[PDB]
Chains A and B, each alone.
Chain A
Amino acid sequence: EVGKAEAERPARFLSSLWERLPQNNFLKVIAVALLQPPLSGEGSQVLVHWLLGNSEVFAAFCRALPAGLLTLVTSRHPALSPVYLGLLTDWGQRLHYDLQKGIWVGTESQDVPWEELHNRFQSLCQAPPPLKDKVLTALETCKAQDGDFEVPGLSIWTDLLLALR
């Protein structure tokens, strides 16, 4: 309705929604909306531009959902892939490995676990080929960047590549 009306931009509408109502529900829905086939894909094509417009909500979006959801989001909209891998790529690098417990952990209470990160990359690998190469190469290029070690203790990224077999 508002798209055809063209009075205000949908951006404004969505930003105001986001501020007014319960966020946890809202995000999940948008999520589900990006996946419904077209009915009259203008809807999805507005919301992706809204989301790329607001990174900070997309930081809580990508954080709050389960893995398969956001994975099939990607195979549908190649426009979200390189930014999403960006988010975790930077979430990986802000941990540290303790030798007492052989596990990566974060400093603050709000830092994603090894298991939730493993999970999300887990899902992205069990996906179509047009995302597999992308995620694989984004990890290999971040491995080489952080010393091309071939053992744990050392690179979060080595840990992953290994953990996949």
Chain B
Amino acid sequence: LELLVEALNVPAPQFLIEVELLLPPPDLASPLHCGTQSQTKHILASRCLQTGRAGDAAEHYLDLLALLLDSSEPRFSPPPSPPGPCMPEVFLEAAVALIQAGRAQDALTLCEELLSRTSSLLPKMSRLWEDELPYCPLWVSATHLLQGQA
């Protein structure tokens, strides 16, 4: 998978009917669907993290996150697609890896960065005063879980 990452780093149409023209787009069930660098590097870190190579996992994740956010200038490096995990589920995977490293002052500059960008979204919790009806998605409640264990 480390080789695959480096491979996907590097990048003529005939006026004739070649075979390519008639081949279908690969599915996701195929062996020929190969994601993007970003979508892959996520493979590596996820699969690294079910084993217990937290240290390795952590490096990999930061590098994922570096790619995604820091890209304003270069070609777009994208997130893992919505059959995969959603972009805030990725900040959580980053944090769980960082805790099992013992980088806990980092597992907090993660949980804080995340709720500082998405404040405008988060519920105002004035239901706290007025005491099922209000709405908070599981990734918030989870960012408070891992802010905590840190």
Contact = CB atoms under 8 A, between A and B. Distances in A.
6 contacts: A102-B131, A103-B131, A152-B128, A162-B128, A162-B129, A163-B129
A114 to B, nearest CB: 9
B contact residues, range: under 10
Contacts of A162: 128-129
Please classify the interface of chain A as helix (H, G, I), strand (E, B), loop, or mixed, using the class held by over half of its residues.
mixed
A46 to B, nearest CB: 44
A162 to B, nearest CB: 7
Contacts of A103: 131
Interface in B96-150: 128-129, 131
A23 B129 CA distance: 38
A146 B35 CA distance: 54
Contacts of B131: 102-103
A10 to B, nearest CB: 47
Contacts of A102: 131
Nearest to A152: B128
B99 to A, nearest CB: 22
B144 to A, nearest CB: 11
Nearest to A114: B131
Nearest to A159: B131
3 tightest A-B CB contacts, nearest first: A102-B131, A103-B131, A152-B128
A132 B143 CA distance: 39
Contacts of B128: 152, 162
Contacts of B129: 162-163
Contacts of A152: 128
B105 to A, nearest CB: 22
